[PDB]
Design a protein around this ligand. Structure first.
Ligand SMILES: [Fe+2]
Ligand SMILES: [Fe+2]
Ligand SMILES: [Fe+2]
Ligand SMILES: [Fe+2]
Lengths: 290, 290, 290, 290
């Protein structure tokens, strides 16, 4: 398939993860057509988040939106690494926020983020949970609020003096222990989840066709007793040692966009360096389509 | 396996349907040990329904109850035809009610039946829905009340001048159109069900492992529009013409006991005869096990 | 416009009331294709009401359903007189119920009727509210239940020795006093309505575009005081003396199908005759369309 | 004061009870102007109850309605005996229902009556609670339903071979034991009232100015214990032996209309006679005024 305005190819890590790259021409026209709205105008007026999405999609002859949706909702796939030729440097952070906003608002809506007070959040890492030699464990987002998070978007804004730190991904259908954990008696028992109002939901559920989906994070699940706590500790080990995990470099200017129901994500350890600098932007939300 | 007090063999119709026959000795001892409780005492005091179950199970060295449960809950099976050597005539109707009560109360509890005002009901057929030349369509029981019916028990009390009229059975896993109907967009949409307070639930759902189960009856489903109504009418035809349907003679003194979640049941047409007489007893309820 | 399977022409009474007549060929094929479902099967299985609708629509090359909907929802129209060549005698009552059922279930669903215990009701008139010399006052149906009745269907099944008795119709946009009553302070005040649980709603409301619609009947409105009661009594007189009222003979085998939000209906007086016989069928329900 | 269409004079029993008599001319014009509505039309269409009220009031140059309201709401009065010259015989029962309906619907609305299924009820007495030698104890109406009854209307339709049976009345401000019972600790304690859903309210309350009002009947009050029951039994005796009670003959064609908050009513004993005949009509409701 030859698409209008972008190309599409499988990643080096997995055929489940597709790489979508906007052509230089699409990128220039996009930036020109959204220059009248600074990032602040997107912050203030949520309708402009959808408008910039429409602008990008029209520049791709209305082929982008159905491709995004089909890829993210397809159980066999459900993940994209996305970039635009010519947006690849920390000095273009505003342009990166604009691009990611447009893509996200073609498939749904980005929820309010408590860490920033906006629909997206940016974080800066320089040199117990912020240990460089520790892996951030695989998890799903949104486990401690009532409404389901359908997607997670993570964009690399900057990277300096950085060895390691790849994003880690696990698709449930590549996880060799899924069948063992999904069939356990505890799998579909509602458990308490709390951040530091509590919600109750199981670790596993099923999609419309009956296939397993997952809502799990070690930090926010609150086992009520020994039985639950021992089972969860083993679950954790069975995720973290999986042979199906992907290790994905996210270069500056690219972002991962993944279906949060059947992908888990995390982050690899990295080398400490006095002049290390890593900057990320995230957006999480719900799918909505006509 | 040689069981104590009963034998067990697959039916002529399907390996999914097992035939359990209590030996003559078990039958005589059972009747002796429950003779102090007439059927009326079972009607009045629901604990005696469980007591007579315990009596039958003890006579089978406590092998009956786990066999019943495992067979009814096993997706590959989930149906029994049950009888007792020496109970085979309409004059022993009381003994038949006692036997069926004991078996049912080993796996759960029989619900109140509006047609009789008791935990079981008996009906007598002699010569538009009571047409002999019409098939009673395949359906699940309990579709129009809030709590799920897990089992259906149908016992033949009497049969005279009767050609045809077999019980019809369809296990979902023998139904060739299951995949087509379970994946349709309407399959898991809650629909209104009413008898002649309304409840809302879908036609299809899933068991704990994600496999399809069904709660359907043509008469009590109330489609809200053309879309729903046309789809249900086709569903009906796809059930009634299935090649997977079993045709099971139920002789006097035997009863079918089936898992109402993944078996549908109905009844075949029969020949009119001036001196026809058919008498049935039913019991429906929920599973409960330690 | 030449339609496939039916013709369509304005009535002698008003361009707002269109007459739709199924051709003889459509009628014969329709009756052949629904002969396997007697009226009782429609009573028992509500999905078959939609199926017979689909059968009629397919015979009209799928032109009937969009024509019905557009006519009934069009403010300038909203009423049909409908018949089928060859169905015109009391001996074909079953065929008349089948036809009217098919048409109704193409535009929505007919609600349960307390007078019959079915989705339609038939009534037989032979020789204070059943006085022949009295007009049945113009009204809307469904005024004393919570959910809105969108349509009313009234079919003449039989008529013998009958002088007068036409159906009376008033479209709000032909009512010369609408503006006076819709602007009164009482027009949009919720009032109590009860049949002989009470509901509360105003006599007037507005459609989506802001135009007046009405939910009124003299018998079931319960004014709470002198002010309300005097105003309603004048409203009544202003309806009953309107110059915009239509007088429509409904011959045997025809039925009126009207939008109950902006049409009121009633019935004219008639001559007593020892051997008078009039038989009607009604169906009332809600619109539903994809 | 000379009123238009009626005269007004204090009763022989008490200055608190005024007698209002419609003149012969007002009566004839009233009957002429309401002849198009039989009593059945009033039953069917509650707005006509208010319309006939308007007709009577207009014939009294709009002086009747404010006189009715002021008299019934005035604490010093609150009771009327009402009649119309020329309506005085059982053969004019329909005219009596029309008159009483008009008066009542000028001051409020008559509630549904369970004994008749209509807004008024008629009863016929001929020769333990229906003993002739027993007094019907003084009480307030409406004590066992949630909403307050503000007025009681009792009209004599017929009387034959009748000695005694006067209506008994007690205004709270003529009751010598009021102060003793109103100040008791139990006076304002909510008690259970039930007819043969229960409501809870005290025996005494206060009007807007802080003056005592009463909601009491011996038959429907349900004391919860010895304390309540003994106090109520003494209350009863203190009402029934009061020196303030009025004894009012109600002749055929007249009706009492009383404020049910500060008047109690009952009925005196009477002589048995083989050919006794007494016929009453009642209406009870709430006040409503602009
Ligand atoms: Fe995360
Ligand atoms: Fe059944
Ligand atoms: Fe009507
Ligand atoms: Fe009373």
């Amino acid at each position: 398939q030859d698409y209008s305005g972008f190309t599409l190819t499988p990643s080096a890590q997995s055929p489940r993860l597709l790489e979508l790259t906007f052509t230089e021409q699409t990128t220039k026209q996009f930036l020109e057509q959204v220059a009248e709205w600074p990032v602040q105008a997107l912050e203030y007026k949520s309708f402009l988040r959808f408008r910039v999405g429409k602008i990008l999609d029209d520049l791709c002859a209305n082929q982008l939106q159905p491709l995004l949706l089909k890829t993210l909702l397809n159980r066999a796939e459900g993940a994209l690494l996305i970039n635009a030729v010519g947006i690849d440097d920390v000095a273009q952070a505003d342009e990166m926020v604009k691009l990611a906003t447009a893509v996200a608002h073609l498939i749904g809506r980005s929820n309010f983020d408590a860490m920033s007070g906006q629909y997206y959040a940016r974080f800066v890492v320089k040199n117990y949970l912020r240990q460089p030699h520790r892996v951030m464990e695989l998890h799903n987002d949104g486990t401690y609020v009532e409404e389901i998070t359908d997607y997670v978007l993570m964009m690399k804004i900057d990277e300096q003096n950085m060895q390691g730190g790849n994003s880690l991904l696990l698709h449930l259908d590549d996880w060799e222990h899924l069948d063992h954990y999904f069939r356990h008696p505890l799998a579909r028992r509602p458990m308490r989840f709390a951040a530091p109002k509590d919600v109750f939901h199981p670790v596993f559920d099923v999609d419309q066709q009956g296939r397993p989906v997952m809502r799990y994070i070690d930090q926010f699940v609150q086992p009520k007793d020994f039985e639950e706590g021992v089972w969860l500790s083993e679950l954790s080990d069975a995720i973290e040692t999986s042979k199906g995990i992907l290790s994905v470099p996210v270069p500056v200017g690219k972002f991962l966009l993944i279906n949060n129901l059947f992908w888990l994500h995390g982050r690899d350890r990295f080398t400490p360096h006095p002049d290390l600098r890593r900057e990320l932007m995230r957006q999480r939300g719900y799918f909505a389509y006509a």
